């Protein structure tokens, strides 16, 4: 996709992450597991909710066919009425069908951007305290216990705190 993350450098999705759209898998001495990123998921959810409302609300006044009848000496008027009601019908079918294809494309790319953005947020915070493995994972140069993991996951990882230890480990 457009942002290169979903079905991209992050090769597959996670069946085991059941409580949100995007998130984390961690692995340390204490063990491993999945957790959704609540903030990115909530933002995406609000965005998508707004989108569906907007598409729907923009087609609340479309054309409505009114039943009318015409005599056998009113064929031109009948055909005009038919062409007209058919015409609007075709316009609204096209509008609904196009809007949906276009917004589906954007929706899928929006999720892809959100994953890439979360990845970059984490990356740009860990800096050189980690190895970037290339598959969506970062390998730490310092031991990172459960509380350390939680600081990463909520955006309060302390780079200066681990700078000295990682640098030594990265070099020996």
């Amino acid at each position: 996709g457009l942002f290169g993350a979903i079905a991209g450098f992050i090769e597959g999705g996670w069946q085991g992450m059941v409580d949100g759209w995007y998130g984390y898998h961690h692995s340390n001495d204490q063990g491993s597991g999945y957790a959704a990123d609540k903030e990115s998921t909530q933002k995406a959810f609000d965005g998508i909710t707004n989108k569906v409302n907007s598409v729907i609300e923009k087609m609340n006044t479309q054309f409505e066919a009114v039943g009318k009848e015409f005599s056998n000496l009113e064929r031109r008027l009948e055909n005009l009425n038919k062409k007209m009601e058919d015409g609007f019908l075709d316009v609204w079918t096209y509008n609904a069908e196009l809007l949906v294809l276009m917004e589906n494309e954007h929706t899928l790319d929006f999720h892809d951007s959100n994953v890439k953005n979360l990845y970059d947020k984490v990356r740009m915070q860990l800096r050189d305290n980690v190895k970037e493995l290339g598959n969506g994972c970062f390998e730490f140069y310092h031991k990172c216990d459960d509380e350390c993991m939680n600081s990463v996951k909520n955006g309060t990882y302390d780079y200066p705190k681990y700078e000295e230890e990682s640098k030594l480990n990265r070099n020996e």
Binding site: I10, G12, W14, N60, A96, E105, H111, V115, G136, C137
Partner: protein
């Protein structure tokens, strides 16, 4: 071999498909179908109010009072009108109905009539009023449209016929009248005595006259003659005047519009069932909260918007990507 954190995305067992611009048939984790495709196959009350079921009668059969339409002599308020494609019971005495489609269009904004006896039959003291036809027979005897009066010769005379009604009913009133175009002269004389007759109708805005046409025509329901009907909406406080030396088919009644609103005539061969809906189509009733439907373009009530689409499914989740 250090500790790791990985960024990733949800996947589930969803097989929901969507289309996009670049790719068709994409599996996504969540999707929203926005197109209603189902209905209950029934004709229903609309918000508790039953349609007017014409059965075998046409709008004309109803309003003229074709004797085969007697169940409709008094009807309550309706939510829509059900008419068959080709109702059997219309003009039993054959003829025509001027501006008939315009009258049907009026019915789309009317939800009830009160039928008012504007020109009681008993008041035509100088004319015979019991005239009927085998074409409108009832129990083997000649009869006639229940709402109309066939004025004929009395004591071998037909004096000038004049009737007048001032619409004091409080609403606009639909009034129908006709002119009889006989098959031949023997018919014109036996019925009306006079030759060279006319039928004149006048209100403040309408001035409409007919001279009857005697002419040989193919028999319809056994009759070579024809009755040509016309109508007007008589305004409040306006007067309609009828005047005739013969061939007048007078209304006895007027239909006061007693309820106005969004309505319509639905073409259907079906019958009303004991069911309730907010949105009726000719195929059946819809009950959905979805914004679109593809059931039928001609709906009545509070309806989704119609489109020709076979499918409309919005992606809400992401691409559902198989595990590694």
């Amino acid at each position: 071999p250090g500790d790791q954190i990985c960024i990733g995305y949800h996947a589930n067992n969803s097989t929901e498909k969507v289309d996009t611009i670049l790719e068709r048939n994409v599996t996504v984790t969540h999707a929203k179908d926005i197109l209603e495709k189902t209905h209950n196959g029934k004709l229903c009350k609309l918000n508790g109010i039953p349609p007017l079921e014409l059965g075998d009668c046409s709008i004309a059969g109803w309003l003229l009072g074709n004797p085969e339409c007697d169940r409709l002599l008094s009807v309550p308020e309706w939510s829509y009108i059900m008419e068959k494609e080709n109702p059997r019971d219309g003009l039993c005495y054959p003829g025509s109905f001027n501006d008939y489609e315009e009258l049907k269009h009026l019915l789309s904004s009317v939800k009830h009539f009160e039928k008012v006896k504007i020109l009681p039959k008993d008041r035509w003291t100088q004319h015979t009023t019991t005239g009927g036809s085998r074409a409108c027979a009832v129990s083997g005897n000649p009869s006639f449209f229940r709402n109309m009066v066939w004025l004929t010769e009395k004591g071998s005379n037909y004096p000038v016929a004049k009737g007048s009604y001032n619409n004091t009913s409080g609403e606009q009133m639909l009034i129908i009248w006709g002119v009889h175009h006989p098959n031949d002269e023997t018919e014109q004389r036996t019925l009306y005595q006079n030759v060279g007759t006319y039928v004149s109708v006048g209100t403040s805005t309408l001035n409409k006259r007919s001279t009857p046409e005697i002419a040989t025509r193919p028999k319809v329901n056994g009759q070579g003659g024809r009755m040509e009907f016309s109508w007007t909406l008589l305004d409040m406080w306006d007067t309609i005047n009828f005047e005739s030396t013969g061939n007048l088919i007078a209304p006895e009644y007027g239909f006061k519009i007693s309820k106005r609103g969004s309505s319509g005539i639905m073409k259907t061969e079906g019958t009303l069932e004991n069911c309730e809906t907010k949105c009726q189509t000719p195929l059946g009733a819809i009950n959905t909260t979805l914004p679109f439907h593809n059931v039928h373009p001609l709906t009545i009530g509070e309806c989704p918007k119609y489109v020709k689409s076979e499918k409309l499914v919005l992606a809400t989740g992401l691409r559902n990507v198989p595990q590694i």
